[PDB]
Each structure stands twice: as C-alpha cells, then as structure tokens.
Paper text:
Epoxide hydrolases (EHs, EC 3.3.2.9) are enzymes that catalyze the in vivo hydrolysis of an epoxide ring to the corresponding vicinal diols. Two novel EH enzymes of the α/β fold class have been identified from metagenomic samples from diverse locations in Russia and China. The nucleophile Asp102 in Sibe-EH (Asp101 in CH65-EH), is complemented by His277 and Asp249 (His270 and Asp241) to form a catalytic triad.
The ORF found in the Chinese metagenomic DNA sample (CH65-eh) consists of 879 nucleotides and encodes for a protein (CH65-EH) of 293 amino acids. The Sibe-EH showed the behavior of a moderately thermophilic enzyme with an apparent TM of 55°C, while CH65-EH showed higher thermal stability with an apparent TM of 85°C, which is, to our knowledge, the highest TM recorded for a wild-type EH to date. CH65-EH forms a dimer in solution according to its elution profile on the size exclusion chromatography column and in the crystal structure, as suggested by PISA. Within the formation of the dimer of CH65-EH 1,090 Å2 or 9% of the available surface area of the monomers is buried. The dimer interface is formed by the cap domains of the two monomers as shown in Figure 7. The interactions on the dimer interface are mainly hydrophobic although several H-bonds are also formed upon dimer formation. When analyzing the structures of the enzymes the higher thermostability of CH65-EH appears to result from a significant amount of hydrophobic interactions on the dimer interface and a higher proportion of secondary structure in this enzyme (56.8%) as calculated by PROMOTIF. In the case of CH65-EH and Sibe-EH the entrance to the active site cavity as seen in B. megaterium EH is totally obstructed by the adjacent monomer in the CH65-EH dimer and by a very different conformation in Sibe-EH in the region of residues 159–180. Instead, there is a separate small active site entrance funnel on the other side of protein monomer. The position of this funnel is approximately the same in CH65-EH and Sibe-EH, although it appears significantly more occluded in the CH65-EH enzyme.
Author numbering:
A (entry chain B): 2 to 291
B (entry chain A): 2 to 293
Write the structure that this text describes.
C-alpha cells in the first residue's frame, strides 16, 4: 500500500517493528511461523477502512529485535511483548487477532491480561491447555507435529530449512495451501528477505524449543491456565496440515464469555490467505457486534 | 513353552541372549522396537515343528549386552552381530526373518553377506536405500516418523517413555495395533520387565540416533548398497502407522534374486501378531515349498 506506514517502538525491553494503517479502534494482527507482518497483506488495507490496524513482527522475526537464547522465547515473555505494545500505542485495550504462534500468544495474553483485550480472534491456533493435554493422545496430531520434534534439535533444522534458498520453508507453505500456487514470485522474494534476516530463523525455531519441547507435549499433568473472560471468535480452516481438529473441539470449557467458531471446511492453515474476504468479513462483523 | 531354551553366546565383542526351540534347518527371527525375542511368542513353537528356531535379543535389548554410546548402534555393527550369531550357532548360513529394526538389519546382513543368508523374509521394514532416499521427499513418511525425531533428544525421551511403568510406550503400541488384546496383562508384565533393564531404553533409542538422525534423513547423497542376491519375501501390513507404503513399493533396483510381496490390507505394523497363522503359512511356503 501507499498508506501503509512502517514504525518501530520500544516494548518489554526490545524494539518491535510494525506496519500500520487506519484510524480508530486498535486492532492487532499477530502472525506466526514462518511468516511476519506481510502474511496480513490482504487484511491490513481492508480492516484499515474502519480500524487502526497494527501488524507487528513478533520477537525474533524480520525487523524486530532478536534476543539470543531459547529462554527468551517463552510464551510468558512473548505475551508481555504484546501487552507492552498495546500500552506503547496509547490504548488501554485492543482487539487482538492471532494466527498460528500469534494466536497461541493471543490466548495467553487474553487469559492473563483480559483488561488489555477488548475482543479475541483466533485463526488456526490451538489453546495452550488443549495442545498440552490432548496431543499425547492424538496420534494424528503427533504425526502432524513431526516437524515440532525435528525443530528441537540444535543447528540442524536451521541448516536444513535455509538450504537451497529456503526450499524447505517454501515447500512447507505450499504443502499447507489448498491451492498450491497461492504465493507469487514477488511474495516469495519478500518472504526470503525476511527469512534471511540475521538470527531470524534460529529465533523463530526457539519458539518450538521453549514452548513445545517434549516435556511440555508429554506432560503427565494438566497446566493451570485462566479462563478467557472476553468475547472470542475462532476461525478454523479444517484442512490444516499442522493441526488436527482434535485440538479445537470444545473451547468453551476454556472461555467464560461469548464464543463463536467459524469453520472453513475447505481451507487449510492459512485461512486468511485462502478466503481473505470472508475472513475479513467475519472479523469486522464480530468486532462491530457490540 | 516347556521346550523353549535360553542361551547366551559371545559374538562381535558382545554377549547375546537368545531363545531356541526345534531342530532342523536354522531359522532366525529378529525383533524390532520396542520388542525383544518375546514378540515371536506365537511363531516360535509353530515354526519349531519344521525348523531350528533362534530368536535373539538384539544389541541393547532385554538380556543382551548394552554397550554405551550412540556409535555402537550403527547398522553395520548390528548386522555383524547377527553374522556372528549365525557362525556361533555352528552353521554357514540361516534363513533370516526380520521385523522393524530386525528387518532393517536383515536387509543389511543379506546385502553385504549373502552367503550367510539362505532366504530373507522381511516384515514391515523398509529397504535401507528406500528409507534413505525417499523419506525426505515424503510428507506422509515424515509425519509417520514423528517419533524418530522425538527420539533424537538426549535423556528426555528415556524419561518420558519409562515414567509410570512405561505408560507412554504401552499407549504407543496400542495406537499401532489393529487388533484387540495382542498384549494381555501377563504379556504387559513381561514387556515391562524387558523394558526396565538397565540401559535398555537408551540403547534401543540409540538405533534411531545412530542411523536415522536428521542429517541422515535429509542428506542429499545417494547411499551405496549391494543388490540382494537371495530369494526374498516381503510381508507388509498396509495399515502401518510407522511406515508409508511410499517406502515399500518399487524394489526393482534393489533385489536381483526372486522377490515376492504379500500385502495384508487389514493389518498394521505388527502383522505377525495380527494374522499369526497366515504370516507363518507364507513363511513356511516360501522357505520349504519353494520354486526354482
Ligand atoms: Cl483439553
Ligand atoms: Cl471453506
Ligand atoms: Cl489382512
């Protein structure tokens, strides 16, 4: 866009890059792996027609700072980055939309800090308690999560993912799309630029090492996780090659607030790229509802 | 059984435990993970009607020695253990039947030492060159091999697998079976005893660390592997949660000698437990009621 603006702001001891367009109610769009703000390229101008849209690069990604060490990527710290971002942007609360890791962070932010979240929207991101409790008993989820186990190993995943101009990552994306030409060559050049930022791949992989290591996946005991107390919308592409439907059933046990789920039976993990207008529509309607 | 006998023998620098029953033509039964000789409990007395059956515990398992270190579980060493066992049993060769890792070892033994193998029977074990070439290009195989990646981590998988009397491992097995009651309460007690042997879990996991680490899976090299020169029967349970059919089709470069494949469309990885009589019948027919 011409109206899209790049900004950097200090939050939670790190500098965060974001793009923004629009005025009004603050709406955050939070990417996951192996994306960055640009995954929201279709939604930013559309949502910016009625809202102040901010799409940051999460800790470790693209133009945001990249602290060294696995411990710097624990979910508690990632959610504190977003809490800090809302404060730094001059709001008491935001509408928070998260996909993939951005959605895991959003569930966490909303649970522990409901005062900062006006409404929560989740795209293809399991609730932490659901993944922690259920994965060990879902052979289909364990199989879909093969690469989570691969990413635990030091050094090798960085090497394999980066080889031949990130051929693996390009493939991972393509294999996940429900039409396999969903990204253009222009998109891919922009993705490679973000992937090639010094330290970005290791930092992204550290999310898996910090938060989805085998102790967490195969924990004998359930975790304590506060109920969600804000209205919540889940958008769920059912042909997700990374997440089994086993993990999104029954979110209401975790939510003490209005809850709605919109299934997209013929979309996969990148629902916002596959049905960009329907996704935008559902978001706008849910936010304008009250 | 009453006629089953336990023995220990020194081979390839380690002491190996095995059970034996029967007299006549020597037949080896080689288990995989997370089994030991006892996976062959149904087949041993039945095959002992026509063969001298020997079912060893592989290096690292149950009553066999358990050398320290990942490097001691490379496939070449494991195959040399079995070559040594055949020699130690007083014969020049044996019929070799292998399931899972025992099958991978059997492919390797047969390729590099064909004079020691009379005939080869493989149950749900991909040819090493097929797994090495194809896995990295097969999303379905990579997904099925989630646990291969899990097992690469030091210490943690041993802890998780062993906790609460091997609750994980029992679950892993059950989720892999397509028949009920393959493990009775009595069988489970016996399994837990073997699993609990000092160093056994680490040694079993070292097969995956030594031979199927991510560098090996994703390597852009083709592997050298001799052609199979002994008659070979592959038995394949199609509902295998661990191995994609991508890895068993198209053997043509790999085998020179006569080859037969028997698919079991309604069995999984543990085909010898799920259709024990049909599996035994195909083995007996192939070995003793052969062609040219
Ligand atoms: Cl749950
Ligand atoms: Cl749909
Ligand atoms: Cl069958």
């Amino acid at each position: 866009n011409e109206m899209l603006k790049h900004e950097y702001v200090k939050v939670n001891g790190i500098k965060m890059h974001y793009v923004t367009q629009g005025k009004g109610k603050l709406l955050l769009l939070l990417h996951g792996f192996p994306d960055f703000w640009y995954v929201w390229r279709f939604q930013i101008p559309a949502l910016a027609k009625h809202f102040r849209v901010v799409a940051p690069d999460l800790r470790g990604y693209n133009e945001t700072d990249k602290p060294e060490g696995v411990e710097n990527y624990r979910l508690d710290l990632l959610a504190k980055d977003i809490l800090g971002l809302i404060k730094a942007l001059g709001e008491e609360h935001a509408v928070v939309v998260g996909h993939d890791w951005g959605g895991i962070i959003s569930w966490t932010l909303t649970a522990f800090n409901p005062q900062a979240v006006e409404k929560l929207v989740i795209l293809n991101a399991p609730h932490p308690k659901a993944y922690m409790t259920r994965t060990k008993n879902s052979l289909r989820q364990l199989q879909k999560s093969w690469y989570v186990f691969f990413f635990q190993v030091a050094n090798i995943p960085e090497k394999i993912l980066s080889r031949n101009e990130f051929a693996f990552l390009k493939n991972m994306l393509i294999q996940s799309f429900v039409r396999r030409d969903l990204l253009t060559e222009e998109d891919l050049r922009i993705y490679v630029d973000a992937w090639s930022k010094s330290g970005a791949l290791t930092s992204a992989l550290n999310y898996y090492r910090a938060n989805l290591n085998p102790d967490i996946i195969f924990s004998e005991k359930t975790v304590v996780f506060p109920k969600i107390k804000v209205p919540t919308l889940v958008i769920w592409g059912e042909k997700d090659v990374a997440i089994s439907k086993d993990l999104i059933v029954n979110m209401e046990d975790f939510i003490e607030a209005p809850y709605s789920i919109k299934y997209f039976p013929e979309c996969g993990h990148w629902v916002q790229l596959e049905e960009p207008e329907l996704v935008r529509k559902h978001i706008e309607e849910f936010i304008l509802k009250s």
